[PDB]
């Protein structure tokens, strides 16, 4: 369900902000950067670790995760 | 109220505060604090303060505040899980029988069996039937029986339970002298009863037909039990 996997997307959002970033991290990145506009496109100054964070984060997700006639009926006893 | 302010409380101090104002006969604040505590926790820790509050109202306002009594009961019902609607439904039936009217107590028990688990619906149905005997008699108890026969799930009662329901129904119908309705009830219980474990059911039916049945119905006995022995 989009509501089910939506609260699971918020699971992932709040979990990953609790897991990969901190408030002084964020606020000193900002303190270096006055524009938090019209700067769209230009990549922002952030630590090179951040990248693998995302990658590792999603890769984390990863480790959580006759012949054809058997499947057919196995749909029907399922249903019938 | 400082303990209740910070939510460091349990059923214990709720009950304690409430009784302490009960003995200073401050029943009104006891009631408001019961209101505080009931929402202050969820069950099964709200069962005990609910028992105390239910009793504290029953004791003091019987016959004068029946409407708010049933207010209390109804909200206690809709917060309580299926696991303990039994004692609360019993309290509600008891008061609205003693001070109230038998008809809405009848519908009380109807609600209870509609609401309690199958495995104890047996002991709740015994109560419903006996109270209906006291207050409405023959046709009403018969309708209780058939209400306990025609209930498709999730109203489901157990085959051994429905077995002895059918047993009681025939034992009372043969009592009143309308034997063939009890014949019908036994045919009903046949489609539920695998014979091999329930020898008492078929024993009652057979020795029953020996006194009220004929050899045509006896061959239909060895035809029905035949079919069921084939069926399972």
């Amino acid at each position: 369900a989009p509501e089910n996997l939506y609260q699971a997307h918020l699971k992932r959002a709040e979990a990953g902000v609790a897991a990969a970033y901190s408030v002084e991290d964020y606020e000193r990145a900002k303190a270096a950067d006055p524009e938090f506009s019209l700067k769209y496109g230009q990549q922002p100054k952030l630590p090179a670790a951040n990248v693998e964070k995302m990658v590792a984060e999603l890769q984390e997700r990863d480790r959580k995760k006759n012949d054809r006639n058997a499947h057919f009926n196995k749909k029907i006893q399922r249903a019938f | 109220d400082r303990i209740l302010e910070l939510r460091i409380a349990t059923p214990q101090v709720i009950l304690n505060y409430a009784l302490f104002l009960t003995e200073q006969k401050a029943f009104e604040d006891a009631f408001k604090v019961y209101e505080r505590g009931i929402a202050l926790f969820k069950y099964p820790h709200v069962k005990d303060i609910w028992t105390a509050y239910l009793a504290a109202f029953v004791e003091r306002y019987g016959g004068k505040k029946l409407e708010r009594a049933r207010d209390l009961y109804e909200q206690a019902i809709k917060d309580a899980p299926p696991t303990e609607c039994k004692p609360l439904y019993l309290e509600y039936a008891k008061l609205e029988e003693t001070y109230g009217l038998a008809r809405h107590a009848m519908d009380i028990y109807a609600r209870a069996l509609a609401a309690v688990p199958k495995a104890e619906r047996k002991s709740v149905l015994d109560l419903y039937v006996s109270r209906a005997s006291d207050f409405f008699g023959i046709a009403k108890v018969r309708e209780i029986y058939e209400s306990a026969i025609e209930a498709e799930p999730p109203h489901e009662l157990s085959d051994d339970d429905v077995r002895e329901v059918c047993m009681r129904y025939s034992a009372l119908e043969t009592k009143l002298g309308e034997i063939d309705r009890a014949r019908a009830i036994y045919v009903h219980g046949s489609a539920v009863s695998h014979p091999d474990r329930a020898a008492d059911f078929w024993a009652a039916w057979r020795a029953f037909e020996v006194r009220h049945g004929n050899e045509d119905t006896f061959k239909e006995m060895m035809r029905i039990l035949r079919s069921v022995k084939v069926s399972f």
Binding site: H9, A20, F36 | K64, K65, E67, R103
Partner: protein, 595 residues
Amino acid sequence: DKQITAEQLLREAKEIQLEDDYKAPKQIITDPEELAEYRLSKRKQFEDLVRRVGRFNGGVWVKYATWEEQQKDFRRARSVWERCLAIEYRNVSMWLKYAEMEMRHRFVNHARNVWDRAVSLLPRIDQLWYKYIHMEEMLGNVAGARQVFERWMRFEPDHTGWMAYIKFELRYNEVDRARAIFERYIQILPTVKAWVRYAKFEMQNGEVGLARRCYERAVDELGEDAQTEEFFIKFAEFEEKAREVERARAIYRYALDHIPKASAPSLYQRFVAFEKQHGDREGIEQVVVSKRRFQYEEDIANYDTWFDYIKLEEGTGDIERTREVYERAVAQLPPSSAEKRFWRRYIYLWVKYALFEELDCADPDRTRDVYRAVLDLIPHRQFTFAKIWIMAAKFEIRQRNVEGCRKLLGRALGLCPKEKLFKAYIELELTMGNVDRVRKLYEKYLEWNVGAWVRFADLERQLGETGRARALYELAIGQPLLDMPEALWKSYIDFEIAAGERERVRVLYTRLLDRTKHVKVWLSFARFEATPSAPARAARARSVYDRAFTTLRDVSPDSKEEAVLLLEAWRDFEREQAWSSEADRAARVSEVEKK
């Protein structure tokens, strides 16, 4: 010994394992130029499959592109994803797999570009926007995540989109930004959900005058269509956890005023839940009782809830209220004049109002009024409630209106001839000691009855008119209408035995034996002869038993159980005889037995 059912053979066929294919042998493969040509082979395989099946059935470009990603060839895999999307760009699954390939290999500007395109082309798939925002905040790029949230808000998402934006700005403890989003949110989707969520945000936030501000602003801005249940439920709960309960009472009322009372059940039960704690005892009692009254007022627009309201008012002390409630319950005449249950219920409810005016109201004039209303609304020529007459008579008797009770009794009599009414009236006539009117009433009940003659004889005996009572019993025996009464027979026998007359009882016994040959009657005659010289009594009892067995023999050749019971009783009494000799008891028992 075992036979051939199907299924087992089918299982055997399954065991025969078909030709599921054996895995290709894992020959060791060198990495250089043996790799490259395996890659040529598998890429030509993919290009062949893709020119065949690629366009018409999806699935294939994902395999091709994940393989090229396994080869760590991302120029090639990006071209495979671009050829998927050149076929069908409206598939969100493909945009997701493309951008995720790009993300999981730290190609983050490439991923941003895929997201920009996916989110430009399908701006109505929320999930694209979510995953773009998520990718940006996983890189700790919250300015970029926020700019994606701004673009998304431009495409006007649902409540969940604006709520996710607000939660985003909260996650970085930016409550000024989240507040500006709430401003925009409640403007864009102007809703009760928008406003109550705004106010929940504020009451979490630290601001309670602002949460009040946002409810107030919801009713002014929202204006119309802020009239609804959950808006007022939320107003109530807010001002409740603000401990402004007078504010909350104003809220609950102004609601019930404005809300269509069709919508009122939940709001009103929750208001009851408010008064649960904060109200006063008789205050909340007033509230619930009033609401019950209108409940019944609409439900009659039902005798059991009627009696229940009677009980509620009577227990609440409100006397005039209970009077008016009984009045309204009697205002509902039975529309179906045939159902004895409903008319009986109506009579019991009016009798309940009667006992309320009688015991609780202390008004005997109002009691006479209620009972006379009951007497006039009950169509006696069809409806026969002796109970109403009896209770009215008791009321008139306690008040000592003797002639009044007599009038009401004669009224029920000349209206609906009733054995129970007549018997109670005669009881009450004996309770005054007016024996002559009692005789006249017994007579008028007889002319309209074994017990009428029986009660008249018993009265004459309780007056000592044993001769007059004996003549009355003789007349009772002489009429052809009460032919086979054994109960009046029992009464006459009892009067003859209590009157010292064994001989009158004997004449009665001869008449009773001549009349009906019952074996129990024969036993009773001989038993009367038995119970208190004693040897003469035993001898007379024996003569009776012998004549009885002889008669039941010559009259009842099949009725063996009758004479069998007779002989059983005979042997029992023969063993029970106070005999001066036990050998005589043995011989007499043997004589009774051998027969």
